Amino acid sequence: GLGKDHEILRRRIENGAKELWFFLQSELKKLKNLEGNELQRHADEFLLDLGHHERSIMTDLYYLSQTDGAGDWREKEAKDLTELVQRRITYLQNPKDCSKAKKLVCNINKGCGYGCQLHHVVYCFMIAYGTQRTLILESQNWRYATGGWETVFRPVSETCTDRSGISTGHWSGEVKDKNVQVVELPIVDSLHPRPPYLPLAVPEDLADRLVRVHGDPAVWWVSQFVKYLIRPQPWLEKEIEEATKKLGFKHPVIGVHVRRTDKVGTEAAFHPIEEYMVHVEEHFQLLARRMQVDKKRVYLATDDPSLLKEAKTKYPNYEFISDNSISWSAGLHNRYTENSLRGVILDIHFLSQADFLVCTFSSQVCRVAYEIMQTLHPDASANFHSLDDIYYFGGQNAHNQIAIYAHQPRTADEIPMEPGDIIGVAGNHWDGYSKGVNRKLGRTGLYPSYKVREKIETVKYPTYPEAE
Ligand SMILES: CC(=O)N[C@@H]1[C@@H](O)[C@H](O[C@@H]2O[C@H](CO)[C@@H](O[C@@H]3O[C@H](CO[C@H]4O[C@H](CO)[C@@H](O)[C@H](O)[C@@H]4O[C@@H]4O[C@H](CO)[C@@H](O)[C@H](O)[C@H]4NC(C)=O)[C@@H](O)[C@H](O[C@H]4O[C@H](CO)[C@@H](O)[C@H](O)[C@@H]4O[C@@H]4O[C@H](CO)[C@@H](O)[C@H](O)[C@H]4NC(C)=O)[C@@H]3O)[C@H](O)[C@H]2NC(C)=O)[C@@H](CO)O[C@H]1O
Ligand SMILES: Nc1nc2c(ncn2[C@@H]2O[C@H](COP(=O)(O)OP(=O)(O)O)[C@@H](O)[C@H]2O)c(=O)[nH]1
């Protein structure tokens, strides 16, 4: 059978879309006949009406995702897959005889901040998993905690944290390293040759189940290594519990990460508070169509300790949840300390727990929070708005899309496409256009975002059947 609610909602979406098309073509024909102030006023009233109409269609699509048991099914399937992957990682990480285990050695001390260093460990872990090597994490003299990883997180194994082997060598590829018991992996920036066990590909054995359950299987797969790595020590778990209570952290909330200080001009622009808060307001308008919004609440994470005062002053209708001493702790004077380490971990935790995330994906901090968010919901792939980049994993293989409809360029800034063309995406301008390279032409420019599909890449990974 099909579900009655499913059929009602599908037809309501289709009728809602058709009515939006009738409304668009009528109101745009009217706009053409106006000028100056009447044109401004008409356009503004039109945008307000379109926002409500658009949000009704998105609300119906949310209900369609849940109806007739689909929500319960998605939650059960996502749980089954996480448990499966976590069991395979635990099995890899816990050989019975550490002496005789194949191993991959990772050093945490890359020359960068916490999110960049966590992503380096994820990259090491994913290649460990692909090559059937126990991950050994070397973390003495960590700039955030001289005592290492186990200052905050559980060790990465219970049975095998020792580097002993009959042979050691620097990574030279799976074929040359086949009989080398312990391989040392460099940073992805220096890795040659590259093995296939890198983002944004996903394991061939899971790909059908992942595409069915999740809008971005690449992030979900990265998130399973993040989930395993950041298992907290009991003292940190107690600190998060009591932080939750003391901050009055509560739902609904929108996470906002504002990255300023040394990021600006090197790796990102300065974005004013108003640019984040436009998307927070829009998302609360959407949530209010399907739930009670007690108070509009924002969890603010920032390395600018003057921002919180600014935000409260400009948005007195909003409840801001923030630890301003964490913001202070993140300045360049204090950043590489255990105090600042606990601060970034807490900010990332609360961001990742929010209903929605507004930030710059140019920041490794926001990307870690978005990856953790994937572990907390069946499919949180769409629960963000980036002011700059799309999701990426530094060191990833080429992010390709496939043109599904033809594009004839209207300006020289646009690229042509025919269906089938491989597009290397550089980003989404959040205005209906993306920028990328039509591979076949080597032309870079703009294309309508709706005219491409994501190319899921799969890789033959080990499946660790003895983990069952
Ligand atoms: C030695 C050492 O320790 N080095 C560390 C270093 O590892 C560490 O991390 C690096 O930080 C910089 C952040 O500055 C990262 O640079 C940014 O990388 C992204 C992602 O690029 C990949 O994916 C995109 C699609 O999202 C794609 O277009 C790219 O080509 C690229 O894919 C590549 O394909 C190859 C095929 O084999 C692979 O071999 C490569 O591995 C793969 N590359 C990577 C890096 O994975 C990129 O999007 C960013 O570019 C934007 O930002 C810069 C400014 O920083 C602008 O100059 C660019 O024009 C572009 O701007 C964007 O343009 C879009 C389209 O118009 C807009 O929509 C966006 O809004 C706008 N964005 C911005 C911010 O303006 C950067 O290139 C690098 O990935 C990090 N690497 C790792 C491993 O973590 C840094 C951390 O600070 O410390 C060093 O010390
Ligand atoms: N507590 C806290 N620290 C931050 C914040 N934003 C930046 N930082 C600090 O600055 C570092 C920036 O390095 P990294 O995490 O690699 O991210 P990126 O430079 O933003 O891409 C973080 O790891 C923190 O140490 C924040 O919102 N809160």
Domain ranges of the chain: 1-68, 69-397+456-460, 398-455
Q: How many Cα atoms are found within 13 Å in the side-chain-facing hemisphere of 77?
A: 16
Distance 179 CA to ligand 2 centre (A): 40
| Residue 207 tokens, joined | 């790909």
* Separation of alpha carbons 381 and 407, rounded Å: 27
Strand-pair partners of 297: 319
* Separation of alpha carbons 195 and 40, rounded Å: 56
Largest CA distance in the chain: 82
* Separation of alpha carbons 170 and 165, rounded Å: 14
* Separation of alpha carbons 191 and 8, rounded Å: 53
CB contact set of 126 (below 8 Å; sequence gap of 6+): 197, 198, 199, 221, 222, 225
Distance 328 CA to ligand 2 centre (A): 12
* Separation of alpha carbons 40 and 169, rounded Å: 68
Nearest alpha carbon to residue 58 among 220, 288, 278: 288
* Residue 398 one-letter amino acid: A
Atom 51, ligand 1: residue with shortest CA distance: 389
Distance 223 CA to ligand 2 centre (A): 19
CB contact set of 322 (below 8 Å; sequence gap of 6+): 247, 299, 300, 301, 302, 308
| Residue 325 tokens, joined | 């001493």
Burial 270-290 (b: 16+ CB within 10 A, else e): ebebeebbebbeebbebbeee
Atom 15, ligand 1: residue with shortest CA distance: 394
Cα distances from 234 to residues 225, 237, 245, 368, in angstroms, run: 20, 5, 17, 21
Phi, psi of 208 (to 5 degrees): -60, -50
| Residue 458 tokens, joined | 């799969």
Atom of ligand 1 nearest to the CA of 429: 68
CATH topology of domain 398-455: SH3 type barrels. (2.30.30)
CB contact set of 162 (below 8 Å; sequence gap of 6+): 98, 136
CB contact set of 186 (below 8 Å; sequence gap of 6+): 170, 171
| Residue 40 tokens, joined | 């401004």
* Separation of alpha carbons 444 and 384, rounded Å: 26
Q: How many Cα atoms are found within 13 Å in the side-chain-facing hemisphere of 122?
A: 29
Q: How many Cα atoms are found within 13 Å in the side-chain-facing hemisphere of 366?
A: 30
| Residue 281 tokens, joined | 């307001």
* Separation of alpha carbons 332 and 456, rounded Å: 39
Nearest alpha carbon to residue 375 among 245, 241, 230: 230
* Separation of alpha carbons 258 and 253, rounded Å: 16
CB contact set of 270 (below 8 Å; sequence gap of 6+): 260, 264
* Separation of alpha carbons 122 and 104, rounded Å: 12
Compute the residue count for the chain: 468
Nearest alpha carbon to residue 305 among 320, 287, 325, 275: 325
* Separation of alpha carbons 300 and 324, rounded Å: 9
CATH topology of domain 1-68: Helix Hairpins (1.10.287)
Cα distances from 270 to residues 133, 260, 265, 267, 362, in angstroms, run: 42, 6, 8, 10, 12
Describe the crossing of helices 364-376 and 114-131 by its angle, rounded to 10 degrees: 50
* Separation of alpha carbons 297 and 321, rounded Å: 7
> Which ligand ends up closest to the CA of 200?
1
* Separation of alpha carbons 227 and 128, rounded Å: 16
Phi, psi of 62 (to 5 degrees): -65, -50
SS3 assignment for 400-466 = EEEECCCECCCCCCECCECCCCEEEEEEECCCCEEEEEECCCCEEEEEEHHHEEECCCEECCCCCHH
Distance 20 CA to ligand 1 centre (A): 38
| Residue 158 tokens, joined | 């219970």
* Separation of alpha carbons 217 and 223, rounded Å: 10
Phi, psi of 31 (to 5 degrees): -55, -40
* Separation of alpha carbons 468 and 458, rounded Å: 23
SS3 assignment for the chain = CCCHHHHHHHHHHHHHHHHHHHHHHHHHHHHCCCCHHHHHHHHHHHHHHHHHHHHHHHHHHHHHHHCCCHHHHHHHHHHHHHHHHHHHHHHHHCCCCHHHCCEEEEECCCCCCHHHHHHHHHHHHHHHHHHCCEEEEECCCECCECCCHHHCECCCCCCCCCCCCCCEEECCCCCCCCCCCEEECCCHHHCCCCCCCCCCCEECCCHHHHHHHCCCHHHHHHHHHHHHHCCECHHHHHHHHHHHHHHCCCCCCEEEEECCHHHECCCECCCCHHHHHHHHHHHHHHHCCCCCCCCEEEEEEECCCCHHHHHHHHCCCEEEECCHHHHHHCCCCCCCCHHHHHHHHHHHHHHHHCCEEEECCCCHHHHHHHHHHHHHCCCCCCCEEECCCCCCCCCCCCCEEEECCCECCCCCCECCECCCCEEEEEEECCCCEEEEEECCCCEEEEEEHHHEEECCCEECCCCCHHHC
Pocket of ligand 1 (CB under 6 A): 110-112, 116, 119, 187-189, 267-268, 362, 388-390, 392, 394-399, 425-427, 429, 435
133 within ligand 2 shell (Cβ under 6 A): no
110 within ligand 2 shell (Cβ under 6 A): no
Nearest alpha carbon to residue 117 among 129, 127, 109: 109
